[PDB]
């Protein structure tokens, strides 16, 4: 059935350690070298990643923008309509990005915007200019 618990002895392994006089000392020396190879290969990436860690020093704190905390409004000020069109030009269909730009429009209000104004700002035409810019 099975060997003592913690003792390992595969059929395959026995054959491999008995196949000659020093198949014993061969296979165990391969592993002594296999280990030292992986051991230094560790300290290489340990050193490598130690540098890339220091290049991220400071984090991104000097590059972080404070909080814009405004309430999603109903009306489309002509300002807001124009911000929209240009956003559509740059972002295409990323309604979330477009919502974020305009600042006070829920993501549906943005989708809702597409359909009704589509005629008047040729939104079709605008996204043909997108995709062509990719």
């Amino acid at each position: 059935r099975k060997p003592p618990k913690g003792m390992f002895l595969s059929q395959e392994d026995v054959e491999a350690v008995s196949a000659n006089a020093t198949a014993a000392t061969t296979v165990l020396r391969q592993l002594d070298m296999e280990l030292v190879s992986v051991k230094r290969q560790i300290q290489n990436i340990k050193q490598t990643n130690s540098a890339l860690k220091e290049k991220l020093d400071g984090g991104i704190e000097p590059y972080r923008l404070p909080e814009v905390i405004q309430k999603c409004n109903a009306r489309w000020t002509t300002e807001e309509q124009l911000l929209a069109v240009q956003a559509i030009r740059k972002y295409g269909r990323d309604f979330q990005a477009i919502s974020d730009v305009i600042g006070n429009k829920s993501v549906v209000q943005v989708k809702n915007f597409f359909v009704n104004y589509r005629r008047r700002f040729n939104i079709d035409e605008v996204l043909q200019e997108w995709e062509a810019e990719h």
Binding site: R1, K2, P3, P4, G6, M7, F8, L9, Q11, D13, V14, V17, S18, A24, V27, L28, L31, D32, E34, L35, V38, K39, Q41, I42, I45, K46, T48, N49, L52, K53, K55, L56, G59, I60, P62, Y63, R64, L65, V68, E79, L82, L83, Q86, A87, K90, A97, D100, V101, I102, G103
Partner: protein, 666 residues
């Protein structure tokens, strides 16, 4: 075990089933109906019980039939056959018992027994008990052979057999009641003392110990489950199979270290790609913040495109600051998952060089027990006799084992100082040519109907031979002599003026420096009333220590004992003795073992008696003339006294069946 069934067990017989031997003598019964068999079995068991409950007096057929009840005592030929069978084969009325009916006036048949070892002496007493002319020839000046006992003053120390290996089923239990035997038990606890002379800590002991026993089980797994029993056309030894198992453990230790570090790197290399991604996002962020700064430097009022640019770049920046925050999330998980892996390293080593020496002691003990280097023991068969092992604590003979063979020798014609030089056996009879050990020219001739050869296997092995067989022993017998192992182990007796060891401790070990010298003085017994420390030499060491003077050897014993007990707690020894069993010519070693390429089946060959060719050609098949007993002939109890004793009983029964006939068959 309770009742009649306890006597069956105590006689090494299954209470509820008829044996192969019993079927041979009682085929009518065993071929017959189930009822009759239970009758038989009970009669047998009861008759045994009776003998056992009082083994200091002959049990007669009358005495037996007397105590039997109905329905069992109805059939008296059945009860007579049973009592006769038992009596014959030494299951009852063996050893030293008081005869009711003094010996038959005259004798039938003449048998020469070579050697007064416990085998010989046991056989002799049985054959004389069966009215035959029995004469034993011993080369030594003393009986017992490999049951030696050193005596001087009040000091008494066995140089040969010492231990009764449990009384449960042991026929020496019966002899121990027939002779006064101061049988002291053995508390098994044995503390080990490394070369420095300081006990291995309890914790350590148990790892190595348990690992040892785990390694043995491992070899059995190799043998039976993986069928690893041949290698390069040579049979595998236990020694080899341990190295293989050990190497495979050392290999596995490394295999795991490899995959643990190989896991670290795969994580480390995920982190490398994450740090790169993060350094390049910090770059785009830095540049993109500058742009949004520049876009807000444009003071209003501004048209809607330059308003859009600020909003655009503001969105685009918080978008990239989302990512980088979600990558510093990921970074923190992988960074601790490394302190995880680098805190749980698998075992540094399989066994350290310190532990490996202690394990070597546990192997030397095994080499002591089997009386041979582990490289010689058969892997498949070394432990074959493990099932027939007796129950109960092991014991010593405190008054000296030689008390037993001496006791057996009483009332026997024994020719001491008589070295058998040649055994001739022919259709018509045997002549045995011996000499006097002292003046070797003075010759003796002995005519007899049959020879019983208890010559030790080491002697049977000698080349050129110490004894000549005429005609030569057949190919099949001489091969089995090559094949089987004869081992060796020596004892050193140290007699002191006072006890300087822990006297609640029977035995304690010493751990050697090397593998090479693991058996050298590796163990000491305090088992005696007096102040005597007995010191053991086993394994490969035993054979080499025979070429070293007693003084030197005593040197190394004291040296060790100083280490353990203090450099001025150990006096000089008053009296010292050193065995050399392999050198001793009437032994040529200690006792048998199952050598690689032998099996149990060779022990049965050793027992098989020899039948000579016919005198006149085309005349009928002769009788068997030359018989064999001894420790090396009993498959299930080799290398013991009880084994020898039992072999003796066996051959006596066989010889008697031959030359006195067997009235008990029907």
């Amino acid at each position: 075990p309770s009742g009649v069934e306890g006597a069956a067990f105590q006689s090494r017989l299954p209470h509820d089933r008829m044996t192969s031997q019993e079927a041979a003598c009682f085929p009518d019964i065993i071929s017959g109906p189930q009822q009759t068999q239970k009758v038989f079995l009970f009669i047998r068991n009861r008759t045994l019980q009776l003998w056992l409950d009082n083994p200091k007096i002959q049990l007669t057929f009358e005495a037996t039939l007397q105590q039997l009840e109905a329905p069992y005592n109805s059939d008296t030929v059945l009860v007579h056959r049973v009592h006769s069978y038992l009596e014959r084969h030494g299951l009852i009325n063996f050893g030293i018992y008081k005869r009711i009916k003094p010996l038959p006036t005259k004798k039938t048949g003449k048998v020469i027994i070579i050697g007064s070892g416990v085998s010989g002496l046991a056989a002799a007493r049985q054959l004389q008990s069966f009215g035959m002319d029995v004469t034993l020839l011993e080369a030594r000046d003393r009986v017992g052979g490999r049951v030696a006992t050193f005596r001087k003053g009040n000091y008494v120390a066995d140089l040969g057999a010492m231990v009764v290996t449990g009384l449960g089923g042991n026929p020496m239990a019966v002899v121990s009641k027939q002779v006064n035997m101061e049988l002291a038990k053995i508390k098994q606890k044995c503390p080990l003392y490394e070369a420095n002379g300081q006990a291995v800590p309890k914790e350590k002991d148990e790892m190595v110990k348990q690992e040892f026993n785990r390694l043995l089980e491992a070899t059995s797994y190799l043998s039976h489950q993986l069928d690893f029993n041949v290698l390069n056309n040579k049979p595998v030894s236990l020694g080899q199979a341990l190295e293989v198992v050990i190497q495979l453990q050392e290999k596995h230790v490394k295999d795991e270290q490899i995959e643990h570090w190989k896991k670290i790197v795969k994580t480390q290399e995920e982190l490398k790609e994450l740090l790169n991604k993060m350094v390049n996002l910090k770059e785009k962020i830095k540049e993109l913040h500058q742009q949004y700064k520049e876009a807000s430097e444009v003071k209003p009022p501004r048209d809607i495109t330059a308003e859009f640019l600020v909003k655009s770049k503001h969105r685009d920046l918080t978008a990239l600051c989302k990512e980088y925050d979600e990558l510093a999330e990921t970074q923190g998980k992988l960074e601790e998952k490394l302190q995880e892996l680098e805190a749980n390293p698998p075992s540094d080593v399989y066994l350290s060089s310190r532990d490996r020496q202690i394990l070597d002691w546990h192997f030397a003990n095994l080499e002591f027990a089997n009386a041979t280097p582990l490289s010689t023991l058969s892997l498949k068969h070394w432990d074959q006799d493990d099932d027939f092992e007796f129950t109960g604590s092991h014991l010593t003979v405190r008054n000296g084992y030689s008390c037993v063979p001496v006791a057996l020798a009483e009332g026997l014609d024994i020719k001491l100082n008589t070295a058998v030089r040649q055994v001739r056996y022919t259709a018509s009879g045997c002549e045995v040519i011996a000499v006097n050990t002292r003046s070797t020219s003075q010759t003796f001739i002995y005519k007899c109907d049959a020879v019983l050869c208890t010559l030790p296997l080491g002697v049977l092995k000698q080349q050129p031979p110490a004894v000549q067989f005429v005609p030569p022993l057949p190919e099949w017998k001489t091969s089995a002599v090559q094949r089987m192992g004869f081992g060796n182990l020596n004892k050193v007796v140290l007699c002191f003026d006072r006890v300087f060891w822990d006297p609640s401790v029977n035995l304690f070990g010493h751990v050697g420096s090397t593998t090479a010298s693991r058996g050298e003085l590796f163990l000491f017994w305090n088992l005696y009333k007096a102040p005597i420390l007995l010191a053991l030499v086993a394994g490969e060491a035993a054979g080499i220590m025979e070429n070293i003077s007693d003084d030197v050897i005593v040197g190394r014993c004291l040296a060790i004992l100083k280490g353990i007990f203090g450099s001025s707690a150990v006096p000089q020894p008053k009296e010292t003795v050193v065995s050399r069993w392999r050198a001793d010519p009437w032994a040529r070693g200690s006792y048998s073992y199952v050598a690689a390429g032998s099996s149990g089946n060779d022990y049965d060959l050793m027992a098989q008696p020899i039948t000579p060719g016919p005198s006149i050609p085309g005349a009928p098949q002769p009788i068997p003339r030359l018989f064999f007993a001894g420790e090396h002939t009993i498959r299930n109890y080799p290398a013991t006294v009880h084994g020898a004793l039992l072999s003796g009983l066996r051959e006596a029964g066989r010889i008697a069946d031959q030359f006195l006939g067997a009235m008990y068959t029907l």
